[model samples]
Target: TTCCPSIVARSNFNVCRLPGTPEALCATYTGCIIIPGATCPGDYAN
Candidate 1:
């Protein structure tokens, strides 16, 4: 199964296709506007 949002970064949308489930794809674009001083999860930072 997969999911994707049609909106991200204030109209800059996800490049991928919309997923089968709507709710699952929503809010998936949290990285569209990475906050200042905000540290990415996992090995996202170097």
Candidate 2:
């Protein structure tokens, strides 16, 4: 709430993508762009 977000109207786009980047540049940025991994133990706890 202190960064940007919370408009009363105008469809509020919500900003403050706040200083945004990459982990190897993600599968591209290696810093991102990839999707997978969450509460895993092995093979992503599949």
Candidate 3:
């Protein structure tokens, strides 16, 4: 029997939303990038 890695629940919420603010700029901004470990494949820096 093989055991798989524990699945982690990813957050669907935005990170740049200010306190008390209900708006999220991540939808239109670059911060909206989803997917685990997402980054430029060839570039060392973004």
Candidate 4:
């Protein structure tokens, strides 16, 4: 079966939060973009 390459997971987590202190930012941060083609578990073609 065809599978996604390692490069797919290399995408960074896009964070959207208010500008504030590090602690505040962490708390205010919302969800992130789930990278596409990241569903492959491993080399299952064996």
Best by lDDT: 1
The digit string of per-residue lDDT tens for model 2 on 1-46 reads: 1111112211221121223322323223211222353332332221
Instruction: List candidate 2 stretches off by more than 4 Å.
Output: 1-18, 22-25, 31-33, 39-46
Task: Sort the predicted structures by lDDT, highest score first.
Answer: 1, 4, 3, 2
Judged by lDDT against the true structure, how good is candidate 4? 0.29
| Segments of candidate 3 deviating more than 4 angstroms | 1-15, 20-27, 37-46
Q: List model 4 lDDT by residue over 1-46, tens digit each.
A: 1232233222211122233334333323322223345554543211
The worst-scoring run of ten residues by lDDT in candidate 3 lies at: 1-10
Query: How should the candidates be ordered by TM-score, best one leading?
Result: 3, 4, 1, 2
lDDT of each: 0.33, 0.23, 0.29, 0.29
Model 1: weakest 10-residue lDDT segment is 1-10
RMSD of each: 10.1, 13.1, 12.2, 11.5
The local lDDT score (0 to 100) that residue 35 gets in candidate 1 is: 34
Candidate 4 is scored at a TM of 0.18
TM-score of each: 0.17, 0.14, 0.19, 0.18
Go through the candidates in order and give the clash count of each: 0, 12, 0, 0
Per-residue lDDT of candidate 1, residues 1-46 (tens digit): 2222223332432332244323224335432323345554443331
Worst 10 residues of 4 by lDDT: 8-17
For residue 12, give model 2's deviation from the true position in Å.
33
